[PDB]
Design a protein around this ligand. Structure first.
Ligand code: HEM
Ligand code: HEM
Ligand SMILES: CNCCN(C)c1cccc(CCc2cc(C)cc(N)n2)n1
Ligand SMILES: CNCCN(C)c1cccc(CCc2cc(C)cc(N)n2)n1
Ligand SMILES: C[C@H](O)[C@H](O)[C@H]1CNc2nc(N)[nH]c(=O)c2N1
Ligand SMILES: C[C@H](O)[C@H](O)[C@H]1CNc2nc(N)[nH]c(=O)c2N1
Ligand SMILES: [Zn+2]
Lengths: 411, 407
């Protein structure tokens, strides 16, 4: 079968065949679309076809499909599964797997970069201290003094589900949040629950507006341990505005390295429950969501006052006006300090080119419009006008439950 | 089978059961989501009538009444005999209000029950259609105090006797292709602006010429009429701080009036059913003015503001976008013409959703369309999970008539 998508601004029509190789479900049916819903141990039985499919993919990409090397590898994996009930990926396979998980990530606007991913193999790790060391090296490599480099670190795969490696932080670098007795929040409201856990686990909180959280690291299904990331490894950027001099006195800053650490990486039926990955920020992630969401730092008002906008009627668009000036500030600050960042115009334009290229060389590009379209100025970006097909390919990144809800405590 | 939707800003969780009453298809499958795609007999007719009459009579608390069963048999006998049937006025009004209620892409549905329905099923000619349409325009415009309305022309019979309004909206600006290869007026209407000329319309070849109506009654050839200029309320666009803005020469019309959709009620098809409400500011300032395949004035405005247009990262496009939208709102408000900003309209839709959840069991909604085209995440609808599904009565798309009509 063939499926067409149309860009309603250019009238370019692309044809998708790649969706035929789709395995996983979407959540939608002929009778309902679940497109805007945020969040919609394997047996010997299920494992071999999942492995075979992946190795077929891998060997195709290297133009060795049907070769003796291909056949021998399938036989070896087969034997290993029936003897040990799991299997180990070769280095080459792991790298290919991790790059393709990113490539297949339909909510990611940054995928033009997918083939440039530094893969750190941490499968020999056994303790939380060893995890800390690997993560420290990842942060140093990825930061690169401001000249950011995409990377992923991969800890040992799941076995019986009782010896999982997990990074309990949602991101390697994130600011604490503290609920006050008066109901107000100091710091990042999104991180209150995790901050509470850290404190209970022994963290001494300085209790400021921008305290970098410690790492909470779980190895081999053991109880998690607290580690502090060396401050000299945490690159931060003070936020100022090119024309507004009072903006610096708002006291804002942010970290340079966006590094997601709570997702599950699935490759050929194997599950890697700890696989922190990092790239660089699109400006609106910070300026629109982190700073201006009502449920986060929420500075729209304070900024709006300082600009002396008419804040009486929403139709003055004072919220919209402040939002833009803030996003100008975030971009200006990072560029001035020479920390890698991309604006939403540049990012979305690059994504359209990537997607066209993918339709031509691969037969499609799974994409989630609800997430691809930026959270400000939607229709003046080329993605808004682009029809997109959403479906799931493997290898892939998946959500998993928060560890504090599932963990069996040793004490 | 019972579905929950979460608002990620307020943690309010709603439970949806209404989707179980859905009959039509979404385009999605378990293997692929098509959420961002813009486009999708006697024996067939009676269950549709029944389904419709059942919900009608349920709404008036007379489900399982003699009056219910009576109408059901009467309609059945009418179909068995005439191969169609006619709606009572009460049912017609119910169906139209519910078609709006069920429109999953419409952010303005909180007003759904306050719709003025004009029954034009006695109309037989294009001059008659014109008259009904002028009356609709004048009633809805109301000197700037806008009122929602729909006018319903005769239903489809054998597909040969179709009533159609050829225009996409009752009021729209012409579009012409100029020697340069550029475009004067509205690029969206070039093809239609030419079908008007190619039918006899003398164009002022200006930038903002109100298009003529092209009206098709009972299948016959379409005819041209100019809407009395005194019936077309327009707003000069000025900025409340930039005195140079008024010299850009922009204006827009007050009345958004969609005329190319198909209204389906109880299996019956109303191919000509123009409806109108009032604008959300972004439709004009973001889409009409700043879209690249429309009036596309961002560059000109940015210049006038003397912004650094060297690098995308100065966000000069964004800055100007906001100002253009401030001006649209300011101009309509100053000239006393009904308009709503995107903040107000989305706040209203949230309240409406919550009302619909507790009184109906849900509210079909298309997030891709409900979220405004600027400042999306600072509006409450961005953080709102929504379920999209198709209920009837409904408004549907239908083919452009100039590809189907046999002269
Ligand atoms: C290098 C520059 C990158 C940029 C500019 C970028 C941008 C984004 C943005 C804006 C989102 C939306 C998430 C949100 O708004 O909260 C996203 C999602 C995502 N990104 Fe990228 N990203 C980059 C690199 C990467 C890398 C290196 C990986 C993995 C190796 C990755 C994997 C993903 C995945 C799996 C999602 C979906 C998350 C979900 O489903 O919730 N990205 N990306
Ligand atoms: C009264 C104020 C109203 C407001 C503020 C409003 C707002 C909107 C907006 C912004 C859209 C998105 C369409 C686009 O961006 O092009 C929309 C879609 C729609 N509206 Fe409303 N509307 C109003 C009245 C009405 C009325 C009176 C009806 C019918 C009786 C209606 C039926 C629809 C339908 C069927 C769609 C979706 C059409 C499609 O699928 O393309 N609206 N509305
Ligand atoms: C529910 N989604 C938010 C947290 N998750 C799972 C997530 C996953 C991938 C990307 C993001 C946004 C943060 C981010 C990460 C990376 C690696 C790059 C970037 N520009 N931004 N977040
Ligand atoms: C791609 N579809 C856009 C044109 N169509 C069919 C359409 C249908 C309903 C509404 C609109 C937007 C114009 C409009 C109409 C009405 C009645 C109110 C309003 N604020 N805006 N457009
Ligand atoms: C490709 C995508 O479906 C298309 O650009 C849609 C996106 N969302 C929209 N939303 C509204 N309200 N109106 C539109 O015309 C569109 N266009
Ligand atoms: C309910 C809705 O799906 C949810 O708010 C989504 C909308 N789109 C998004 N898009 C991005 N990039 N990031 C997000 O967190 C969200 N949130
Ligand atoms: Zn869907």
């Amino acid at each position: 079968r063939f499926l067409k998508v149309k860009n309603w601004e250019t009238d370019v029509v692309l044809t998708d065949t790649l969706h035929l190789k789709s395995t996983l479900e979407t959540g939608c049916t002929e009778h309902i679309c679940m497109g805007s819903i945020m969040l919609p141990v394997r047996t010997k039985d299920q494992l071999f076809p999942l492995a075979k499919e992946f190795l077929d993919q891998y060997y195709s990409s290297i133009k060795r499909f049907g070769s003796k090397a291909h056949m021998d590898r399938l036989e070896e994996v087969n034997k290993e599964i029936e003897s040990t009930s799991t299997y180990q990926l070769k280095d080459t396979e792991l790298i290919y797997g991790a790059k393709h998980a990113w490539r297949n990530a339909s909510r990611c606007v940054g995928r033009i970069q997918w083939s440039k991913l530094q893969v750190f193999d941490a499968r020999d790790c056994t303790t939380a201290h060893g995890m800390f060391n690997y993560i420290c090296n990842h942060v140093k490599y990825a930061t690169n003094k401001g000249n950011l480099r995409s990377a992923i670190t991969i800890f040992p795969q799941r076995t019986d589900g009782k010896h999982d490696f997990r990074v309990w932080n949602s991101q390697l670098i994130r600011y604490a949040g503290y609920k006050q007795p008066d109901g107000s929040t100091l710091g990042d409201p999104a991180n209150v629950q995790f901050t509470e856990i850290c404190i209970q686990q022994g963290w001494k909180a300085p209790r400021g507006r921008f305290d970098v959280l410690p790492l909470l690291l779980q190895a081999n299904g053991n109880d998690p341990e607290l580690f502090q990331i060396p401050p000299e490894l945490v690159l931060e950027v003070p936020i100022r505005h090119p024309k507004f001099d009072w903006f610096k006195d708002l006291g804002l800053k942010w970290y340079g390295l966006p590094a997601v650490s709570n997702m599950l990486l699935e490759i050929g039926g194997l599950e890697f429950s700890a696989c922190p990955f990092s790239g660089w920020y699109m400006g609106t992630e910070i300026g629109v969501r982190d700073y201006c969401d009502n449920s986060r730092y929420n500075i729209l008002e304070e900024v709006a006052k300082k600009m002396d906008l008419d804040m009486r009627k929403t139709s003055s668009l004072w919220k919209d006006q402040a939002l833009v000036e803030i996003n100008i500030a975030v971009l200006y600050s990072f560029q001035s300090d020479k920390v890698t960042i991309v604006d939403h115009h540049s990012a979305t334009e690059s994504f359209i080119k990537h997607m066209e290229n993918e339709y031509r060389c691969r037969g499609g590009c799974p994409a989630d419009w609800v997430w691809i379209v930026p959270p400000m100025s939607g229709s003046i970006t080329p993605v808004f006008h682009q029809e997109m097909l959403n479906y799931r390919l493997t290898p892939s990144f998946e959500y998993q439950p928060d560890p504090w809800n599932t963990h069996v405590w040793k004490g």
